Design a protein around this ligand. Structure first.
Ligand SMILES: [Fe+3]
Ligand SMILES: [Fe+3]
Ligand SMILES: [Fe+3]
Ligand SMILES: [Fe+3]
Ligand SMILES: [Fe+3]
Ligand SMILES: [Fe+3]
Ligand SMILES: [Fe+3]
Ligand SMILES: [Fe+3]
Ligand SMILES: [Fe+3]
Ligand SMILES: [Fe+3]
Ligand SMILES: [Fe+3]
Ligand SMILES: [Fe+3]
Lengths: 169, 169, 169, 169, 169, 169
């Protein structure tokens, strides 16, 4: 048993490794979304940058978990990360819909991992999840919702173009 | 009778107390419009900020009346401030429409309060209303009117989105 | 069902709405206290400024709940905010007493709202209440207690006048 | 029952009082290790500085609990703080092993203190423990483990000398 | 046929796509080596940093190919990126060994991809590879070679610990 | 025999070790006094700060004896540090009374220690004691004496409060 290990259950540890793979997967989806909007026949530079940034954020969420596995004495076991479920992503609105669903899946995965650590009274891993993940998920879910409502409000064509300029930095 | 009291009628004092309540009511309405436009299914951030600012303004209007009540030696008697008459406020135009109707009702009440001061020869109170409320009401009613005209000009959909970006700071 | 909703129980949504009303009620009490100490026959400017700041803090607490309600996909339903139970507030000691009682009431309400989010497994909402409200309430209740003790220590007359200058900034 | 006291069980209050004594004991051990490496026949100044900082940290942890105890309206009851279990701490590696052992005991005492708060529904005390102690214990325990591994990698003599230079700042 | 497509053979487009996967695989390998060396029972932080930088460099290389794919009019097709062949990487020397081998494999892949562009007369794509990838691969192979030579020269134990401080920044 | 030892008697080395303990006990007494004045029913924040500082000083006094023990080739032997003889400390005058009495006991212990160095012709130790301790004690005893006088002069209630503001920084 590892030098740091203390109040750290095998299930919690196994649960962290899968969340790592899930975050790496979301990272990979947004990377695909990013370069999809870089296609010459889509060419929406705001969406390109917006999804590049979210890809980098998911990569960072993954590595924060990997680092946390080491802090508690756990051991990182990596898995294949699957190519995303689509090769392209439609309109700006379609991609934002897909992002919301993906974020709500990730949010549920977090809440399930929270229940895991709760059953094992992993008091510190609970506070880790609440502080560094659960709040930011709630924030991102509301932001993406707001983007959906506005992508619907502006319509297609010019309206999507403007949203690309004005709502995405 | 209070140390400062001079040329200050009980009708004026009572009328100040109910104008305080009306400004607090107008404050609460704009607070309600503000967060209505923050709902994920509305999500116009300029209208949110704009009505948060108007809500803060009305609170200052009320507190300045309280401050003035004490200056003249009257006594602040507060009342319930009723919830606004709506839970949601429609489109940007709808809310600006309702804003104009509220501001003109506040302006008419200020004019009636001036009339109370005039009939009691309260020279200073009349100038106070003219200087710190009547001029600002005229400015604001005209701005809100300018907004109504432009909300109509741009139309629903992309137009309302553009107005939110370009006319509300 | 709204786009952001996830792990968000109808009972929690309803508890947030009545916490909103409780914060606005606290705000309104402190506004009343502030301008009571501005009366020409009270005229304690430190107590005036101190209670203005608490009033603005309570308004901030209410609006943070409103913002959070929208974040989780809940819907704000406002209610009348009732006039505070007193029109005058006695001595500095008396008002500070009444403040401590008010703050402990708000703290018990927050704890009961916490209990609600717990029974529904709202791990994010529990952390939000702990992060943005429970720690501050403990801080504030201790501060007001120190003030009561010191307002007893200094006594009446010059004592209260010196506390006004030295302990409220 | 003290002015701030609310939701604060006497088991928690007594739990804090004995945790206070536990942190002061770790402070006193680290103090002893610091000056032990200051002996002319030991003379590792990096280790001397390290453990003085550790001793100072533990002093802050203890005083942070005394402050919190007063915050909730508990009453601090101090006890004898026993001398540490050794007068000399061997090699750099020995002292670092002894540190890991001491930290995990303190971590366990904190998790037990958390369970006391949990059983009495002290939501604010639970958060205080997770935010200001548990995360730092997990950090420090991983950090000491890294030093253990490296003190072993470098071996005795020159290795221990370079570690004193290159890893203790 | 996409708007930019000119002198761009489907075999080139497809070689780019699988080169992308290899660069993402190389990225994922270095990520694993990085967090391996972050393990409490390894704890070589200079190696941790070193591979985290190489991981990010590979990610850049992958995205630079996705960007170039869109520039020529091809279409990114992403595949699963496989978990690395090891869960742990041994000593610093072992991991550096592994890194040289992985880098030479990728260099060979790039040379083969060049050959594909050469047979189809893709002048711009050959230069693109020489300028942003081939020169960098020669540089990196020589530097990893140097590190191996020095990892052997220093030996194990204290020697590896000094290489971690003095050769890895 | 230790490398630096010269002109250094074991009665002197033993006398240093029990002065170390006596300094840590005074450190602990002052720590107690500090947080007693941090109680919500005492709430004298100038006294809190004054005694925290006096406690940090005594800690330094103990560590300077620890440092000197090692300088001369002696060996530090620590003992339990007794909890202070009181759990609370009364009014401000009361605590400053206790402080002067504790400080005069520390001074007499130092004078007795100086007699030990004198009988064994420890010329350096006698100078060390005169330079870094005997002069500070005479300063501090005078300052506390002045504080007593003024605490009596101001009396109870407002006087105490104003002493806490104007005489303790
Ligand atoms: Fe994520
Ligand atoms: Fe996210
Ligand atoms: Fe107004
Ligand atoms: Fe207005
Ligand atoms: Fe509040
Ligand atoms: Fe408060
Ligand atoms: Fe600690
Ligand atoms: Fe610690
Ligand atoms: Fe590469
Ligand atoms: Fe490379
Ligand atoms: Fe002293
Ligand atoms: Fe001393």
């Amino acid at each position: 048993e590892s030098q740091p290990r203390q109040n750290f259950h095998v299930e919690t540890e196994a649960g962290i490794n899968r969340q790592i793979n899930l975050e790496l997967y979301a990272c990979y989806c947004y990377q695909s979304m990013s370069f999809y909007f870089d296609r010459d026949d889509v060419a929406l530079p705001g969406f390109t940058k917006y999804f590049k940034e979210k890809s980098d954020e998911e990569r960072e969420h993954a590595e924060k978990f990997m680092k946390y596995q080491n802090k508690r004495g756990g051991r990182i076991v990596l898995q294949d990360v699957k190519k995303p479920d689509r090769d392209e992503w439609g309109t700006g609105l379609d991609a934002m819909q897909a992002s919301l669903s993906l974020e709500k899946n990730v949010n549920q995965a977090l809440l399930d991992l929270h229940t895991v650590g709760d059953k094992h009274g992993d008091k510190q891993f609970m506070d880790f999840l609440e502080s560094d993940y659960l709040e930011e998920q709630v924030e991102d879910i509301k932001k993406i919702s707001d983007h959906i409502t506005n992508l619907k409000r502006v319509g297609s064509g010019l309206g999507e173009y403007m949203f690309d300029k004005k709502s995405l930095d």
